[PDB]
Amino acid sequence: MEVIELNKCTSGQSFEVILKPPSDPSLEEIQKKLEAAEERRKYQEAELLKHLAE
Amino acid sequence: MRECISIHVGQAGVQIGNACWELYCLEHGIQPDGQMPSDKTIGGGDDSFNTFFSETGAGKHVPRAVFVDLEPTVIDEVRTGTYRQLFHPEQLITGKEDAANNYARGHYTIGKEIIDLVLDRIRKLADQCTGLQGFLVFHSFGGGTGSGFTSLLMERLSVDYGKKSKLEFSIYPAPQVSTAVVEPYNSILTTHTTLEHSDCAFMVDNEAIYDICRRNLDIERPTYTNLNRLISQIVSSITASLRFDGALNVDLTEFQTNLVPYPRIHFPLATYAPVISAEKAYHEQLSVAEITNACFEPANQMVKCDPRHGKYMACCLLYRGDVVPKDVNAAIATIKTKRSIQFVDWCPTGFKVGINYQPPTVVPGGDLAKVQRAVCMLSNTTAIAEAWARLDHKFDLMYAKRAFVHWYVGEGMEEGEFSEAREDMAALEKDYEEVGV
Amino acid sequence: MYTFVVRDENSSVYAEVSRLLLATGQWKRLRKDNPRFNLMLGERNRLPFGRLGHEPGLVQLVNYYRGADKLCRKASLVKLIKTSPELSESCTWFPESYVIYPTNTDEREVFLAAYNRRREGREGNVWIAKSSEGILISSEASELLDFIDEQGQVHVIQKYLEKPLLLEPGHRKFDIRSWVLVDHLYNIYLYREGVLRTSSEPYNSANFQDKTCHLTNHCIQKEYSKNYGRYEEGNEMFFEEFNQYLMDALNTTLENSILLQIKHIIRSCLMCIEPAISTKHLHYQSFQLFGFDFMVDEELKVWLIEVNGAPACAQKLYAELCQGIVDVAISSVFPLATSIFIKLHH
Amino acid sequence: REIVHIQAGQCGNQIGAKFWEVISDEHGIDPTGSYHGDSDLQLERINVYYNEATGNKYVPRAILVDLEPGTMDSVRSGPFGQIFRPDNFVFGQSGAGNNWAKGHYTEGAELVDSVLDVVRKESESCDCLQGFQLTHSLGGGTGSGMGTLLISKIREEYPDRIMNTFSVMPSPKVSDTVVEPYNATLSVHQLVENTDETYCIDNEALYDICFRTLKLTTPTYGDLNHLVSATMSGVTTCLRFPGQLNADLRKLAVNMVPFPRLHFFMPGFAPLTSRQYRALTVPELTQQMFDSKNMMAACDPRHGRYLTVAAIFRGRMSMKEVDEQMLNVQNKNSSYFVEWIPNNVKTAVCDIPPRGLKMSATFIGNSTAIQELFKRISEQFTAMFRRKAFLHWYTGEGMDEMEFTEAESNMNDLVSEYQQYQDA
Ligand SMILES: Nc1nc2c(ncn2[C@@H]2O[C@H](COP(=O)(O)OP(=O)(O)OP(=O)(O)O)[C@@H](O)[C@H]2O)c(=O)[nH]1
Ligand SMILES: COc1cccc(Nc2cc(Nc3cccc(NC(=O)C4CC4)c3)ncn2)c1
Ligand SMILES: Nc1nc2c(ncn2[C@@H]2O[C@H](COP(=O)(O)OP(=O)(O)O)[C@@H](O)[C@H]2O)c(=O)[nH]1
Ligand SMILES: [Ca+2]
Ligand SMILES: [Cl-]
């Protein structure tokens, strides 16, 4: 059980104990998606309004 | 010194951010008007606390923080509360109507119209940075803002700051404190869309925090105030290495290096001890050995799960208070003979240990007793996947019936995003099982 | 009122447990996938332990110990006994056993260095091969490993007990089955009534693939054996007959000659795995009924050969045993409106 | 923030006036619109339902609609009748004759644009309008016919605001005319398509409560309406008072309605009050709020399954005890909650109790048993329609038999949809 990389300062200390050794899309690609969902929304709204017009 | 910007999204993110910044000021001796008398470099500095605070000419110490919500009521209590002078108005961004517990509304509909203002306030903080290392992002999984707007923000931040690290503090949904039935949907959707933009995420199950508040703090019905002061103790313990002199976990890169060997398995488990009620009349102070052993009781975890039935990939111990290495090594030695601690074959069985001699600070009139030593263990165990299983199972029960889906399609999301997200989660669960069994 | 769920309909014992619970008038069975239960009678495979203990307002108990499979699958058990210091390689009551994988870690380069010192020292050198049907009892290695690799599964080869205790009249083998119940508090309860699963063929120490004098299994005995039923009804001799036969033929009791060793072995195994599977501080609770399989030799030394995590009781005993499971595993956790078990503790 | 309230027709206006009396009392506002209570919690969210007029006077954001002037003259003469903005009284002269067609297609059509003008003036003076509520009956002609015409016009002009109704269902035991099944079937078709939530208030249920448990031997419309206004107060109290839940319209709609058309709610109130005093314990409250006999829609909950449930408690009580009793309800009767909506029962608490009570509870259930209500109407409808009885009142206003056949089919469709999820 050997203690390695012991560092000491006035605030505290740190070290390591080893018990045993080892056995993204673009900005255009995103603006496209946001606006595509906005198109699905404005289409659904148009369907609603034409239905109310009938 | 390299600066860290904290981003708090939606109600949970904002109120937890409040708690954390209050605690931070108490620990660094920063008053509610931002003056820090111990700082003798007025108007500037590159000390360790300057990772989280900037300084003005008048010696005001200012959090490197942005708060974002799609409705005003929560951040309006920041703008009018005890630490109003702490933050600068451009740092507090609110919309008019929120996401209505709807991921699609936070990501697509209402998010698209505020993302650019948020990125611009963020850039105004980044331009104040000499060597920004990245971001700490606080949010719920369950709310529509915390889920949808957070994943939109994370995508963009990857684009606008490709080389910076991003760390999450994530509030996982618990029915006992939930006011929404579609949180499993929002959780899955945001986990899927954020998975590749997050370098390391700390998940806090409100169920675990709630039951800790009941058992150990004797609070019969914990409020958000109770949950958040305990959460902020854990958060502070995890970030103390960034804000104080030391040699372990000194930059965001080291959190990934030390805790996330496999980048998809980036969800370390936090276990914290001791949690002692300030009303406890007589408390026998717990030793190094007793608190280190408490780090292996599931009742102290931030997610209830059984690390004995999984495998560890990494293990960090962060002490605060009267602790020296020999007591830690003795405690580890005896814990190893009485507990089931199995690492993956391709990792060393070992512990990275950080000690800060200052004991935990407590909020005056909070629920937590002062103790002479405390510890937060961060272990990357496959057992945390239990939470994913729970969440996925709830998701499946609702989605087999398409229950509530129309609310999401009606904001422009397509149904196929549901099963895409769910299949990403099924892959995640199989990653965990192949690593851990 | 308490609520429970059934997820293994092919379980005889917990089928009876469901019946008894319903007849109490204070237990109601929900559908298999309703989560608002107190008791899950789980499935045998991939029981979803990660979903128990997360239902507010409900104390949840399940009839399996997560991780008990380490004791209840053959290679698991060999690795457990050799690697656990509590049990040790130097374990006097488990037969010499080696874990060997198919051609297609492994212990056959370890197994040869012992086997051939058995052949040189001119000791008896019969070994038996099995996996968790497909049995080879042979006297030289190249039959064993050959056979194991014809199959595709991880296997173990165990020193076949060539000198067993033989029941007269008959000159015939038998194995002992002990039913053990571990409650949520990890009390170990050995049920008063064990059973002897007998052969009806006279042990033939000559050609080891008359696999009907050598294999005590209740099924291979009924089908292919000559005299299924001559001596005892169903090749099932119970404990009073066995004690009486031990008293008469051997001038000992069952308690002193065999049971002390059986209690020692059961307690040792369960205590070995207790820290890995105990639910003492867990958000849900476990109990489990195990079946332990023993073989007595000629010198009256008890050997453990297997633990089964989902046993079937003897038909004569189902009633009393399942009622006991209810009394100490279920009603201890969920109280309703001279015990049949011996607590093992030391 | 702001809600716009509309009340239409006789029943719509009588129950709407009782709603404004009850909540004006709760917020300490007198029949002249002046505040006179103690707590400031009474005024923190007053703007949800009241506009602040000069003098710190509070004027209901309420529009009053009828095709005859009677009931609105009665409300101007009533207890709180001078609280209402006089410009918000919009009425015709000729009445609707209990005729859906007159309300929807002829007389109603002539009045509707002036009503929308008042709606528009109220809306454009809102910082953050969340949506609308309508009180009306489905059995007459103005509330049902003109109220659904209004609903569709409002949706056209405000497609992204929440639309809720408090909809009195007709019953033969409390019945004005034989054509009520026709007017209700025609209306339900509209409601299934253009509202976010409909509170189904069965007049049979209100009668039975007044008779069986309030021991009122001969219930008047007043007796029935006291129940309705107490219930409506209950279901809106979380919007009107500050609490740990920043309660709004949309999040209830999102969380209660798993399928767009299945948005018909069974409301309930506890303890059921007359015009007695033994205080109630939290377990007692909790058992009564789920009691079939405290529900205002004459449906047996045990004949269906709950899709979602909102439970609202009022007064000061132990939240721990509330949580325990709510969990006991769900865990001891888990059959009746659908397992494929996990944790489908949510709890809200308002610290301020209603008048005359220290503790009360309000129940809002989305249950499949509501299909029973629509089956009743449908049977009543079909018994007349198979002989085309009383149709001439409608064909004389321009309607066709085909529109009757369509509304009948659509309501049977809605019944089948509920049945689909009762066995899923
Ligand atoms: N621990 C903790 N959890 C919180 C807090 N606030 C909200 N939550 C949890 O967060 C989830 C609800 O999401 P919120 O963060 O409130 O929602 P939001 O991000 O504001 O999104 P919308 O309001 O729907 O626009 C639930 O699981 C809550 O229990 C908090 O202060 N502390
Ligand atoms: C089954 O799921 C549920 C169940 C109960 C709550 C919730 N959560 C909510 C709910 C909410 N508004 C709300 C809450 C209570 C009552 C009402 N009354 C009204 O609207 C009357 C109709 C105008 C509105 N606002 C934020 N969260 C979820
Ligand atoms: N609960 C209740 N129901 C009413 C009231 N007035 C009428 N009704 C019912 O409403 C239907 C008559 O509709 P009504 O409102 O009078 O017709 P309208 O004026 O044309 O809208 C019938 O079902 C009546 O039983 C009332 O004050 N309270
Ligand atoms: Ca400085
Ligand atoms: Cl970069």
Ligand SMILES: [Mg+2]
């Ligand atoms: Mg919010």
Ligand SMILES: [Mg+2]
């Ligand atoms: Mg009338």
